[PDB]
Amino acid sequence: MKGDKKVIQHLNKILGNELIAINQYFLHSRMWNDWGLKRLGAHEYHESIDEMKHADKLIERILFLEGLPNLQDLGKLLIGENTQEMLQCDLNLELKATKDLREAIVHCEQVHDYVSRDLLKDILESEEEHIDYLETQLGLIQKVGLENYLQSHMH
Amino acid sequence: MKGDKKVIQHLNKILGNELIAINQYFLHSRMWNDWGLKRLGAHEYHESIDEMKHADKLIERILFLEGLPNLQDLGKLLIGENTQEMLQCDLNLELKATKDLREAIVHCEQVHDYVSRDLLKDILESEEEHIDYLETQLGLIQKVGLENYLQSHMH
Amino acid sequence: MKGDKKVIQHLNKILGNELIAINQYFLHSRMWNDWGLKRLGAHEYHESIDEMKHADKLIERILFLEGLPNLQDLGKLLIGENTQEMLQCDLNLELKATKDLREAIVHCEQVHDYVSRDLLKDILESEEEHIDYLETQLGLIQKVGLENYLQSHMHE
Amino acid sequence: MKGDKKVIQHLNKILGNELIAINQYFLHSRMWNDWGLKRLGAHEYHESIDEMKHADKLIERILFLEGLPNLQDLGKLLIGENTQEMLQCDLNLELKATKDLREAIVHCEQVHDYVSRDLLKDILESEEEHIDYLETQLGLIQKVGLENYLQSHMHE
Amino acid sequence: MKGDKKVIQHLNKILGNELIAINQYFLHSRMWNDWGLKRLGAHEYHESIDEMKHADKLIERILFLEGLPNLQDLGKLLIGENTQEMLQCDLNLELKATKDLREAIVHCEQVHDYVSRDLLKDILESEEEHIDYLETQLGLIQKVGLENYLQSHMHE
Amino acid sequence: MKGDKKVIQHLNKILGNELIAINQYFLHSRMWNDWGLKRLGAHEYHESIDEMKHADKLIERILFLEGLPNLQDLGKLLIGENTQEMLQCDLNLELKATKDLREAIVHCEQVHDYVSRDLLKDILESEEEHIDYLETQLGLIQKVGLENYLQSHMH
Amino acid sequence: MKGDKKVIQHLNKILGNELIAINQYFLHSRMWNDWGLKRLGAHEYHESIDEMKHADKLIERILFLEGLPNLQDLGKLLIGENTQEMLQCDLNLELKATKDLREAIVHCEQVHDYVSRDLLKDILESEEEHIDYLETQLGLIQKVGLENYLQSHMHE
Ligand code: HEM
Ligand code: HEM
Ligand code: HEM
Ligand SMILES: COc1cc(O)ccc1CCCNc1cccc2c1C(=O)NC2=O
Ligand SMILES: COc1cc(O)ccc1CCCNc1cccc2c1C(=O)NC2=O
Ligand SMILES: COc1cc(O)ccc1CCCNc1cccc2c1C(=O)NC2=O
Ligand SMILES: COc1cc(O)ccc1CCCNc1cccc2c1C(=O)NC2=O
Ligand SMILES: COc1cc(O)ccc1CCCNc1cccc2c1C(=O)NC2=O
Ligand SMILES: COc1cc(O)ccc1CCCNc1cccc2c1C(=O)NC2=O
Ligand SMILES: COc1cc(O)ccc1CCCNc1cccc2c1C(=O)NC2=O
Ligand SMILES: [Fe+2]
Ligand SMILES: [Fe+2]
Structure with missing residues (x-):
């Protein structure tokens, strides 16, 4: 089904953000595991898997709309x-992603691509859940102190 | 995550309506139970719990957006x-609630808070199902007569 | 069964305290959850549910006694x-609640409403258990430090 | 254990009321069953059984206190x-019974027989629950009409 | 169904005997329990329950025959x-009860109320089984001695 | 929670009575078992356990009320x-215990410590049941004779 | 079986130590529970129970040996x-206890009461395990710090 060219460009932009996140979160996960912070490692792993599933849905939607999903261009990993930096890097990436998601939804609404909008809204709900997790972790580092925060994520 | 100030004000207005509804429905339920109309009492209790769950979700969303959920100001209970009057009081409250939900969704859309809009759309679906229930009960009173209607809600 | 007017007034005062506590504890619960302190959030949630069940019993008793349960007035949330301040606000509220419960029980006894007395005694038992919980949490913060106390309440 | 003479006299007065209630409720139950109102008949049977259980407990307490339980004197059945009249008869009997229970509890408290008071308070709670049932049934008769009310109690 | 007036009068006389027995056996049961003779107390409780079941059936039959079951008049408890005296008291009551049952059956047969006769015969069989139990217990007291007999009924 | 000083003194006096009863019942139990009267031994053992459970509740209440539970002073064992004498010694102890319980309940009521009263009433109900048991055993000895009574408590 | 008089005196001395320990550990348990240190409270409760079981075996042995078990004299609770002080108080008591156990075993061996020796040796093994626990707890306070040590004993 022939999709709106600019919708497909927005979807490819969102996909590009998810592809950065997959790699950034997977590397952060394996860094934490190597450091013996296995609870952070497992949770970051699951964040990476979530971004993989969103990327899958975006790829499938673009192909249905007769576009070319861009898996070749990879932007800058943070x-x-x-x-502390790893969590902040994830959060900075997420805040860019949700800005881009909002602009994509605006355009889907204007051209009546309501199914693409629904997909982007579901992804945005997941990303805002991830922002909530990240903001809370950075707040916990303040409330319990860094040594305790790391201790609580060893096992 | 920093939310739009007026979105938060809208969410607090919806929360205020839910807080009224919780108490109004809880009292109606226990009144109906006291009167021996336990099928009405039990159905109205479940309506109160549902409003409690909506309030919970609004409180959680407001806190995520870095606002203050107002649980202090309670408006007028109907x-x-x-x-028949209790059902009509519930209906009047629900019609006010859905008007406020539509205005809040408009503003969520205008400032691109699509997750807040989606939460409010879900609440609106629940309130419209409650409106359907209430209008149907009021219609049943007309069709089967008040005495029969109450008889059917004793056990 | 028409109850004593002042008994019903006492029951509505107790109910009014329970209504404040429902909302205060529910907001504190969700604040702690928002902050990542989910074990505190869960325990405070269950305290809020407990107050909801007390409010229900009071409403039922007032209706049986042919009074009007007051769910309209809401007093000041702390x-x-x-x-630490959230726990202390919960404790200050509970100490006001148990003083009110004692005065209500005295009056129930004087007018021979022994069933309302028994209900209030059961609620008083629950509120003293909550006071025990809150004083102990405040003491633990002093013994293990706030950072350790919060750490121990991160995961449910 | 030697109990207070006036406590035992109060306990025998409460027992006398329960013996009336047992028989009154059992006959009402079987009348309703004979008339085809089997839901009323079954509910009233369970009220009779409950009064039998209360009478058992009173008999047991009187004997522990070295009194003679009075099962010989039977007051007037209503x-x-x-x-409608049968429900009102039960209600009139319950209102007399709860008055007597309160006066007995007063005296138990005065002479420090706290266990007898506790037993009487538990009975008083059951009787107030019965009054609630009866008042509610009589209100339903007015709200749904006598014909509907009886219709709703034909089948169990 | 309109029953024979004198049949109903006989049924009310049998019912009166059962109401005595219910109360007599229940009190004996609780006396034995208070004294620590719990096997006697339990057996006598089950005798009381059986008389309650017989009274139920008599009440139901009287109402079917469009009579008024007499639950107001209570004769003398023994x-x-x-x-030993308690067992003899039960026995004296049962021997009076079976005499009355026979006279009632005579009259049911004369006026062709065969269903009432059948109910009374079933009750008569239960009462003769009770007489057998009582006579046997009293014989055992003589054969094993009072002290042994009571010893054998301490524990259930 | 700061308790009434005289309530706490009453609670410590009740606790004192329970501590005597724990030891008296436990020794009587083991004496009966040594004599081959194991049904008496077992029942008296359960009486001792019950008093242990009451003592526990009293200790917990005293500490909640910010008093010092007195486990140091032990009164005279009977x-x-x-x-026959052992049963009578238990009964003499219980009759003192219930008198002290009543005086303590009076004072709890006067100072509105309704929860302490409720605890003491529950303990009083247990002690009255023990009195019933003991009076009944002494009555059985007279009805069945000592030799049969002891025989019935061998196995 | 007529035991050695001095064995019985030693058994009564060990029993006296156990009676102190029962009460001291029970009170420490309930203090820790009140303070919200429930893992410590639960562990100390089980220590108190273990001492109760030892006391029971000593009482039983003394009676078999035809002595009088002394449950009247209660020494000084620490x-x-x-x-930190409660742990060290427990340790001081246990060190006195094991010294007395060794002296009692020596005497049992000298008068050939090999079964009493075996009982005391089993108790000594339990008390040495308690000493290991206590010394280890005090050492952990030094290694992880008091605040962490207490944190680790908040939750069962
Ligand atoms: C801020 C206002 C309130 C909030 C946010 C709230 C929230 C909740 C929630 C989330 C539940 C659990 C529902 C479930 O998933 O099963 C609940 C249960 C309940 N609530 Fe509320 N509630 C509020 C006020 C009240 C009031 C005023 C009453 C009664 C006067 C009440 C009575 C109850 C009862 C009886 C239950 C069921 C508890 C149980 O037995 O499990 N609530 N409430
Ligand atoms: C002193 C008077 C009475 C006493 C102490 C008494 C006591 C009791 C008790 C304790 C029960 C057992 C209830 C339970 O735990 O489930 C019972 C059952 C019953 N009683 Fe009575 N009752 C009395 C009078 C009567 C009378 C006058 C009748 C009939 C007219 C009656 C009919 C019954 C019946 C039908 C049952 C149920 C038996 C079953 O389990 O199927 N009772 N009674
Ligand atoms: C002579 C002194 C005591 C002796 C000989 C003794 C003996 C015993 C024994 C044998 C048990 C059962 C242990 C098992 O489960 O196998 C027990 C349980 C218990 N004891 Fe003691 N005890 C004594 C004093 C105390 C005291 C002073 C208290 C409280 C202050 C106490 C509180 C308890 C409790 C709470 C239990 C558990 C009961 C249950 O719920 O099963 N004991 N005791
Ligand atoms: C998937 O597109 C198709 C749909 C069709 O129906 C038929 C053919 C094609 C493939 C055309 C060559 N595609 C390339 C080539 C290089 C890199 C990329 C891609 C891409 O599609 N995403 C990349 O990153
Ligand atoms: C959610 O509040 C916070 C979030 C934070 O992250 C930090 C601090 C706060 C508390 C600030 C005082 N809040 C009050 C005070 C009074 C009444 C109300 C409230 C409220 O928030 N709702 C009411 O009904
Ligand atoms: C005796 O009735 C009245 C006397 C008056 O002077 C004025 C109005 C009424 C009936 C008003 C119906 N009841 C209401 C109404 C609003 C709020 C509540 C309730 C309630 O019962 N609990 C509440 O929180
Ligand atoms: C509880 O009776 C006892 C306890 C004992 O320990 C020793 C003896 C007795 C029986 C004394 C004669 N009792 C009668 C006689 C006739 C009617 C009644 C009663 C009665 O007790 N209640 C009645 O309705
Ligand atoms: C079976 O009664 C009825 C059947 C009906 O179909 C209609 C009405 C009646 C009630 C007439 C008044 N009955 C009383 C009154 C007082 C005492 C007794 C009774 C009684 O019946 N037994 C007593 O001990
Ligand atoms: C529970 O006591 C406390 C509560 C606190 O919050 C802080 C400290 C303490 C310990 C104070 C010393 N207590 C002793 C000393 C010797 C004997 C006894 C006791 C006792 O308490 N009961 C006895 O039998
Ligand atoms: C176990 O005693 C016996 C064994 C028997 O075979 C026969 C009689 C007796 C009782 C002799 C008086 N006993 C008392 C008296 C007071 C305190 C204590 C004791 C005690 O034994 N331990 C105490 O703490
Ligand atoms: Fe109808
Ligand atoms: Fe730590």
């Missing part, structure tokens, strides 16, 4: 050097 | 003194 | 801005 | 001639 | 002051 | 030299 | 005012 990799932290300690737990 | 308490009836007989079965 | 909302804290950090964990 | 038997109605139609469903 | 309460013993020790185990 | 130990019998035969079964 | 009650701490904070966690």
Whole structure:
């Protein structure tokens, strides 16, 4: 079914953001595991899987709309050097992603691509859940102190 | 995550309506139970619980958006003194609630808070199902007569 | 069964305290959840549910006694801005509640409404258990430190 | 254990009321069953059984206190001639019974027989629940009409 | 169905005997339990329950025959002051009861109320089984001695 | 929670009575078992356990009320030299215990410590049941004779 | 079986130590529970129970040996005012207890009461396990710090 060219460009932009996130979150996960912070590692792993599932849905939608899904271009990964930076890097990436999601929804609404809008809204709900997790972790580091926060994520 | 100030004000207005509904429905339920109309009492209790769940979701959303959920200001309860009046009081409250939900959704759309809009759309679906229930009960009173209607809600 | 007018007034005062506590505890619960302190959030949630069940019993008793349960007036919520203050706000509310419960029981006894007395005694038992909980949490914060206390309430 | 003479006298007065209630409710039950109002007949049978259980407990307490339980004297049954009157008869009996229970509890408290008071308070709670049932049934007769009310109690 | 007036009068006389027995056996039961003779107390409780079941059936039959079941008049209880006397009291009551049952059956047969006769015969069989139990217990007291007999009824 | 000083003194006096009863019942139990009267031994053992459970509740209440539970002072044990005396010693102890319970309940009521009253009433109900048991055993000894009574408590 | 008089005196001395320990550990348990240190409270409760079981075996042995078990004399409880002091009070008691156990075993061996020796040796094994627990707890406070040690004992 022939989709709106600009819808497909927006979907490819969102996909590009998900592809960055997949890799950034997977590397952060394996860094935490290597450091022995296995609870952070497992949770970041699951965040990476979630972004993989969103990427799948975006790829499927673009193909249905007779576009070419862009898996070739990979933007800049934001990799932290300690737990605090890694969480902040994830959050900065998520805030860019939700800005881009909002602009894409605006355009889907204007051209009546209501199914693409519904998909983007579901993804946005997932990303806002991830923002909530990240903001809460950074707040916990303040409330319990960094040593305790790391301790609580060892096992 | 920093929410739109007026979105938060709208969410607090909806929360205010839910808080009224919780108490109005809880009292109507216990009145109906006291009167021996336990099928009305039990159905109205479930309506109160549903409003409790909507309030919970609004409180959670407001806190995520870095606002203050107002659980202090309670508006006017519409308490009836007989079965038909209590149903009409619930209906009047629900029609006010859905008007407010539509205005809040408009503003959520205008500032691109699509997750808040989706939460409110879900609440609106629940309130319209309650409106359907209430209009149907009021119609049943007309069709089967008040005495039969009450008889059918004793057990 | 028409009850004593002042008994019903006492029951509505107790109910009014329970209504404040429902909302105060529910907001504190959701604040703690928002902050990542989910074990505190869950325990405070269950305190709010407990007060909802007390409010229900009071409403039922007032209706049986042919009075009007007051769900319209809501007194001042005591909302804290950090964990220690939130617990202390809950404790201050509970100490007001148990004083009111004692005065109500005295009056029930005087007018021989022994069933209302028994209901209030059961509610008083629950509120003293909550006071025990709150005083103990406040003591634990002093013994293990706030950072450790909060750490121990991160995961449910 | 040697109980207070006036406590035992109060306990025997409460027992006397329960013995009336047992017989009154059992006959009402079987009248309703004979008339085809089997839901009323079954509910009233369970009220009779409950009064039998209360009488058992009173008998047991009187004997522990070294009194003689009075099962010989039977006061006046209040038997109605139609469903409304039968429910009202039960209610009139319960209102007398709860008055007597309150006076007995007063005296138990004065002479420090706290266990007898506790037993009487538990009975008082059951009797107030019965009064609630009866008042509600009589209100329903007015709200749904006598014909509908009886229709709703034909089948169990 | 309109029953024979004198049949109903006989049925009310049998019902009166059962109402005595219910109360007599229930009190004896609770006396034995208070004294620590719990096997006697339990057996006598089950005798009381059986008389309650017979009274139910008589009440139901009287109402079917369009009579008024008499639950207001209660004859003289025979309460013993020790185990032997209590058993003898039950026996004296049962021998009066079976005499009355026979006279009632005679009249049912004369006026062709065969269903009432059948109900009374079933009750008569239960009462003769009770007489057998009682006579046997009294014989055992003589054969094993009072002290042994009571010893054998301490534990259930 | 700061308790009434005289309530706490009453609670410590009741606790004192329970501590005597724990030890008196436990010794009587083990004496009966040593004599081969194991049904008496077992029943008296369960009486001792019950008093232990009451003592626990009293200790917990005293600490909640910010008092010091007195586990140091132990009053006079009433130990019998035969079964009849042992039962009578238990009964003498229980009759003192229930008198003290009533005086403590009076004071709880006067100072509106309704929860302490409720605890004491529950303990009083248990002690009255123990009195019933003991009075009944002593009556059975007279009805069946000592040799049969003891025989019935061998196995 | 007529036991050695001095064995019985030693058994009564060990019993006296156990009676102190029962009460001291029970009170420490309930203090920790009140303070919200429930893992410590539960563990100390089980220590108190273990001492109850030892006391029972000693009482039973003394009676078999035809002695009088002394449950009247209760020595000085060592009650701490904070966690470190309570642990050290428990340890001081246990060290006195095991010294007395060794002296009692020596005497049992000398008079050939090998079964009493075996009983005391089993108790000594239990008390040495308690000493290991206590010394380890005090060492952990030094290694992880008091605040962390207490944190780790908040939740069962
Ligand atoms: C801020 C206002 C309130 C909120 C946010 C709230 C929230 C809730 C929630 C989330 C539940 C659990 C529902 C479920 O998933 O099963 C609940 C249950 C309940 N609520 Fe409320 N509630 C509020 C006020 C009240 C009031 C005023 C009453 C009664 C006067 C009440 C009575 C109850 C009862 C009886 C239950 C069922 C508890 C049980 O037995 O499990 N609630 N409430
Ligand atoms: C002193 C008077 C009475 C006493 C103490 C008494 C006591 C009791 C008790 C304790 C029960 C058992 C209830 C339970 O735990 O489930 C019972 C059952 C019953 N009683 Fe009575 N009752 C009395 C009078 C009567 C009378 C006058 C009748 C009939 C007219 C009656 C009919 C019954 C019946 C039908 C049952 C149910 C038996 C079953 O389990 O099927 N009772 N009674
Ligand atoms: C002579 C002194 C005591 C002796 C010989 C003794 C003996 C015993 C024994 C044998 C048990 C059962 C243990 C098992 O489960 O196998 C027990 C349980 C118990 N004891 Fe003691 N005890 C004594 C004093 C105390 C005291 C002073 C208290 C409280 C202050 C106490 C509180 C308890 C409790 C709470 C239980 C558990 C009961 C249950 O719920 O099963 N004991 N005791
Ligand atoms: C998937 O598109 C199709 C749909 C069709 O119906 C028929 C053919 C095609 C493939 C056309 C060549 N595609 C390339 C080539 C290089 C890199 C990329 C892609 C791409 O599609 N995404 C990349 O990253
Ligand atoms: C959710 O509040 C917070 C979030 C935070 O992250 C930090 C602090 C606060 C507390 C600030 C005082 N809040 C009050 C005070 C009084 C009444 C109400 C409230 C409210 O929020 N709703 C009411 O009904
Ligand atoms: C005796 O009735 C009245 C006397 C008056 O002077 C004025 C109005 C009424 C009936 C008003 C119906 N009941 C209401 C109404 C609103 C709120 C509540 C209730 C209630 O019962 N609990 C509430 O919170
Ligand atoms: C509880 O009776 C006892 C307890 C004892 O420990 C020793 C003896 C007795 C029986 C004394 C004669 N009792 C009668 C006699 C006739 C009617 C009644 C009663 C009665 O007790 N209630 C009645 O309705
Ligand atoms: C079976 O009664 C009825 C059947 C009907 O179909 C209609 C009406 C009646 C009630 C007439 C008044 N009955 C009383 C009154 C007082 C005492 C007794 C009774 C009684 O019946 N037995 C008593 O001990
Ligand atoms: C529960 O006591 C406390 C509560 C606190 O919050 C803080 C400290 C304490 C310990 C104070 C010393 N207590 C002793 C000393 C010796 C004997 C006894 C006791 C006792 O309490 N009962 C006895 O039998
Ligand atoms: C176990 O005693 C016996 C064994 C028998 O075979 C025969 C009689 C007796 C009782 C002799 C008086 N006993 C008392 C008296 C007071 C305190 C204590 C005791 C005691 O034994 N331990 C105490 O703490
Ligand atoms: Fe109808
Ligand atoms: Fe830590």
